[PDB]
């Protein structure tokens, strides 16, 4: 009558982490810095676009003025 039976106990392997808290924090800090740099680039790019738009009008005005002056001088000369 040496017929034995058993029961079982369970253990849980550690969840997936303990490497997600050293590279993670550095990743977040770098992401924040990149976000700030992107915001600054946004602002600078908008300012540059405004300045180019401003330049356009003066360019067109000088072109028109020179063309009209040349035509007038030619007309009077002949």
């Amino acid at each position: 009558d040496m017929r034995n039976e058993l029961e079982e106990m369970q253990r849980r392997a550690d969840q997936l982490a303990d490497e997600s808290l050293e590279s993670t924090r550095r990743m977040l800090q770098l992401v924040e810095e990149s976000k700030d740099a992107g915001i600054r680039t946004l602002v600078m790019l908008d300012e540059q676009g405004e300045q180019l738009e401003r330049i356009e009008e003066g360019m067109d005005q000088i072109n028109k003025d020179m063309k009209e002056a040349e035509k007038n001088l030619t007309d009077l000369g002949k």
Binding site: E8, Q10, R11, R12
Partner: protein, 83 residues
């Protein structure tokens, strides 16, 4: 003045159908205190390592907290072990 400490244990035994659970239920109903915690036999066992003992220890949390906070001006807590 007498410097005595209260009793914290009662055991009831006898043959079947003689009025044990009835006594425990009526004692729980008599006292003006929090609702008693009742354990229905072997409800504490768990398949994981350590969880059975955590379950036994989670019964004595409110009592410890109230003893730490209110000291001697504290209520009564009743725990009933069935079987």
């Amino acid at each position: 003045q007498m410097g005595c400490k209260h009793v914290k244990g009662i055991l009831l035994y006898g043959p079947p159908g003689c009025g044990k659970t009835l006594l425990a239920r009526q004692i729980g109903k008599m006292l003006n205190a929090r609702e008693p915690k009742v354990v229905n036999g072997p409800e504490i066992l768990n398949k994981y390592v350590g969880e059975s003992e955590a379950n036994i220890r989670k019964l004595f949390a409110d009592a410890e907290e109230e003893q730490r906070r209110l000291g001697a001006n504290s209520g009564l807590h009743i725990i009933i072990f069935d079987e």
